[model samples]
Each structure stands twice: as C-alpha cells, then as structure tokens.
Target: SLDKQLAALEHSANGRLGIAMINSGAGTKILYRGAQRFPFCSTFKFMLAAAVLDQSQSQPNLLNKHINYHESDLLSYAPITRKNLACGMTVSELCAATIQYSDNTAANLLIKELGGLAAVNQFARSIGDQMFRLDRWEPDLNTALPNDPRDTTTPAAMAASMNKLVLGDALRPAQRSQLAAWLKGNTTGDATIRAGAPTDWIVGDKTGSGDYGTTNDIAVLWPTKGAPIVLVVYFTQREKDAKPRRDVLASATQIILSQI
Candidate 1:
C-alpha cells in the first residue's frame, strides 16, 4: 500500500531514504527503509534547543543573561561574521530565533556559549539519546562520512526522541514546557511534513538540509484524527540532482498525509 509513496520518494532521491512513524503510546512502529541512517543536518537543532532550555530551567536567571558576540566570536564559525552578528544577545532570545529561523549563525553561537558540542551531546545523553552524535558543526566535503561534520540518526531514533517530546516524556516539566514553546516557534517546515497535514493541524518539529545528499525533516504532528503521530522522514540525493529529488520527497509526504 505504501509502495507508491516509496516510489515517489525514490524518484526524487539518489542516495538513500528513511521513514518511521509511530502513534502516540504505541510500542510498535511503521518503518520504510527506516533503520537506515543519514545526516540529520538542521534537525539536530531540536535536541540542542531542548538541551539549552533544560539547562536554562535549572537556573532560571540564565535565560535573562546576555551572551556577547564579538568579532572574535565570529572568527571560529563560518556562518557568523563580526559585521552580521550583533554586539550581544541574550540566551532566551537566541533560543527563539535559532529554533524559529533555523539560523546557523545563532545556533553556532549557542553551541559555543553553552560549552561546545560535547555539552550538547552530554545533554542529549541525559535525555536518553546516546545514539545521536554531533560529528561536526559544518558539512563535510566528502558528503558521506561515517561521522561527518553534519550529524546523523536513524528515523527510528528520531521518532523516539520526538515521541518523548510530544508526550512530555523527555525533560522535566518546566524544561518540557520550554522545549515545546521553542519547537512551536519552528518556522521552516512548510515544504516538508507540514505540507501534508490538514489546515488546522498543529505540527511542532524541525527540518534539516545539507550538501551531503540529505534533505530531511522530523516532526510531531498533532492532528484532528488518530493519536498524535510522530512523522520521521529523511531524504538523500546525489549532488548532481538535489532540488528535483526534494520535490519528490515533499510530494511523497503529501500522499502519505492524504491517506492518514
């Protein structure tokens, strides 16, 4: 029944594709090439956002503290330059913008200010995601590193993390509220998972794209029907043909939503 959906996805992708869906509270799953791993790209930001918020909740005043961004702060990161980034910004504001816009510069700044990538991973481990790895803050030229600068995870794992988020099962109560607020602010899923849902359905999730043959999105969809569903999707394509492949990926999602 899902082969047409899979074929539609294959038309737009060149490398590999993975998808996993699970209804809220269910122990089993729906998988389509799902255990396969691919670069996570920006979707990793969701975990980062959750971790940052969790840290802030521990010390509420940290949310009010301002983080300065100087010329030197921009030097280490490719996305931010002294001219473009502001002289300073607060943790809460940075969290909002980073989650909403998928701003790489802002996210990188948060990574540095929050004690580096290891801290993020440490936070993830605390929240039960030892499988996730932040291999690099930037995409690799190779596009296919077993461990690239771009992070990677399986659809199965992505769905698990998202399920935890939806059920308020991951972080503490206050942290869960903070993460949900930030995820609701996510502004970039129009072309992917959200494209398939009903007009009034609420979706809180993240999307990621990279040169390493991956255009992906993982989301928690709160629909009018069925239990709240977590939709985990990944699209990977050859550099030579990326756009068309993503379009196919998006189209396949539309078909899937129509049935559900």
Candidate 2:
C-alpha cells in the first residue's frame, strides 16, 4: 500500500516534489521525499491568522475599529466591497473569514488592522516561525517580481505550526477553537488531501495556489484511531492538468494516513 501511494505521487507530480508529516505536539514525524523549500501561496494565512489574534488579545478594541477597502486595499486577490457598510469587524470574525474563506481581502485587511507587515512578522517570530515573510501586499511594485515574495512557506514549517494548533498551543484555547471551527466550515477548494479516506472521516485543512508550479494542501485528519496526524503535501512546476497532481498528493497522504 505504501508503494502504491508512492507510485501515485510519482505518476501525478508536475515537476520536483516534497512531502513531510509531523505531530508537533509529541515531536514525532515521518518523511518520504525531498525537503527543499516550496512556496506556500495562500497557506501563509495560518501565520497571519495567529498574528491578528495575538494583537487583538492585547488590544481588544483593535478589531472593533471600522476600516474600509479602497483600490489600494484590493491586492492581487479578488476585492469585495461591503457598500456603505462600516468595515468594522470583530477580531474573531476576521479570523473566521481569513481561514474559512481564504479571503485575500479579509487577510490583508487583518494584516493592516494588526499594524502592517512588521507587526505580523513580530507575531511570527513569537510563535517560532522564522522562515515566513511578507514581500509586499497585492498590486504593489514587487507584485511583478519573478516570485511574489508576499507569500511563501515550507512544508516542514507548515506541519509544525499545524501541530501547534492541534495540540492547543498555537493560540488561547478559546481562540484556537474559533479558528478550528472556521477551518471546519471551509467548503471550497481542492480535495487532494482527503481522496483516499472514507466519507465519515473528519478532514480539516486549508489549500494554497499560485501561478507558478506551486499547489499545496495541509491537513489534519481525525480518524477513529489513537492520535491525529498532521500532513503537508506540496507540488509545483507541473503541467496544466491538476488531476494527476491531486492523485499523487492523495497517494502520499494515504501512506501517511495508514501509518497513524
């Protein structure tokens, strides 16, 4: 079965590939491929989410402040306007939309609400994520760079951070639960991570995509078993078709799932 999963991964990948699995809470892990760095696309939201929540806890009224989206606010991601609607939103609600919908505007809005890139970076360092960074917001001069540095992350980092979340250590229990619930409510995007599982399994996750070869989905599957395992599958530089890639990712996920 493990070999079958590996074969699927090799058969479906577009270009180079890498995968990593870790239980951050217990410090246990397994690796079956490369460890090279891969761009995370929108998956960076996890870090941003943590940053926003941390800032809000210190200044509860921060999320309560009203803010509106202007052209500058509409970065590379799709822009949405709440017309004459006060842009004010609770910190908790922003976290919900940021993760649940993967809303770029909502994410950027939160970043601004938290006081720009440096503030989020400070939060990242506090949480032990040193590899993350914000090159710039959408529609900026750096937007055209060979690689949009605004978003980037590694498989190992994602797995570890996810473990932190699962183990009740990322944010306060109440705040963390709020985030988990939002992730559970996420109904859009790829099914690569859950392909081989039975319908009854509870798979909570988030996906990231980019114009480059990058496509990834990080997941935590709650099987009727001993402990939950965190898995990160990342792929890039592949051709247009993603079915093969998805199947390959699912294969790797199946292997990891069987182990737990």
Candidate 3:
C-alpha cells in the first residue's frame, strides 16, 4: 500500500523518488528506491559538519579557531558568511551557518577545515557508508547533472549515516549533541518534513536542491510517542535545468508521515 501510494505520487510529479526511513526505537526500515542515487547538493554540508565535529574530538579547541574570508570567498548563497565580513567566524559558527542556513561559503570554508572534498568522502566511508560521497565544493557541487555519479548519494546511505551521527555512536558524545543541536535549530526545511510531522513532535532536518528538479530533505523526527524516526526523501526529474518543485517536497513528507 505504501509503495502503491508513493508510486502514484512519483508518476504525477514526473520524477523519481528515493526514500529510506528508520524507526530508531524499533530498529525497522522502510525503503522505496532507497538505494538509488540523487544529487548530493547542500545536504552534504551536514556530513561536512559531522566530520569537523569528529576531528574536534581529538584535536579539541579546533572550533575556537576563527577563519577569515574576503569577498572573493563568498558564493551565491553565502548569507551568514557574507554578513560576518567585518569579523572572522569560528569553525563552530561556520558549521552553524552551513547547517542552519545552508550557507554556501560557510560550507566551503568548513570543507577547508576538514582538509578537502576527499576528506569529507573519507569521513563518510569511515562511518561505513560508501553510498554517500562528495566530489566537489559549493555552488558547482550542486550542479546535479543527470545520470552523473559525481556528488551523489543514495537515500538509504544518507539516512543511515545520519542516524549513526545523530543517535548512534559514530560521533563522540559532545560532537553528536552539537550536531543534533544544529539540526534542531535548522532554519530551512520547516515546511517540508516539519509540516508533515505531528504538531507536537520535534523535527531536525537538512534540505538540498539542485538542477534537474532535485530536492531532498534528510530528517530525524523526535516524537514522544516513539523513540525517533530518521527519514530521507529525494526527488529528481530528468528535465534539464528544471526548477525545484517545493510542493513535491511538502506533499511527499505528508505522505511519508501518514505511515510513520
């Protein structure tokens, strides 16, 4: 019945959807094309943040280091980083912008803190998730080319890794709480998964959008009724340079919530 409903929704939206959800308390999984790949987009910033937090565990005080940038460093959507031009931003601040605001420049700068693009992918692999990969930096990394594997990740991989970071032991306790706090305070994605979630439930999520109508939201839903639910909704159409369908994100979250 779930597949039938999701299939109908996908057809009408003229796109394919990849989904994966886990019931943390029950250790159950729900999958619909969960292994299929979609553009990585801004959601990769979450992983980048986690990787930084992991490093901070050993290095400690890494976040206190401030990094300065010039106008040349700003990307198209670097709102937080742009405003901080008068003052440098600490690594923690960059992570906040990258996750909460999905700031482009902030993400790139954090990538530098983690070393480079390969390091981020390495972090994913370190967590036992090979399907989540990052090949490029901000702005261009969101290109979302059709049929290209670069900068793409599966719904299952994203969901699983997110669970490991947020609820599991993949990250140190301090880093885990920090990452969870950042997600909880996310300014984006409120209308997507947050809309479908029970009014009293707390939802933490990261949103991504790119060319070819790719829009995704990876989330953790904290409900008093259950332990927690981690889910990913990835939608992508083949139409070249397609504008994002925000409603599809909203409606899909609604449908997913109907069962959860």
Best by TM-score: 3
Two-way lDDT contest, 2 vs 3, winner: 3
lDDT of 3 by residue, 109-149 (tens): 88887878888989999999989878888888878877789
TM-score of each: 0.84, 0.80, 0.97
State the C-alpha lDDT per candidate: 0.69, 0.63, 0.88
RMSD of each: 3.3, 3.8, 1.1
**Model 2 lDDT per residue over 1-260, tens place:** 65456646565564545577876445688765534566676666766776766565677776566665565554444433332234545556666667776767777787777778788777767778666666565323122223334555567766777777655476778666655666656654446787755467777777666554456777776666446667888776544333325665666676676766
Query: Which consecutive 10 residues in model 3 have the weakest lDDT in total?
Result: 240-249
Off by over 4 Å in 3: none
Residue-pair clashes per candidate: 2, 3, 0
TM-score order, best first, reads 3, 1, 2
lDDT of 1 by residue, 119-143 (tens): 8778777767656777676433115
Candidate 1 residue 173 Cα shift, in angstroms, is 3.8
List where candidate 1 sits over 4 angstroms from the true fold: 25-28, 72-84, 139-150, 244-246
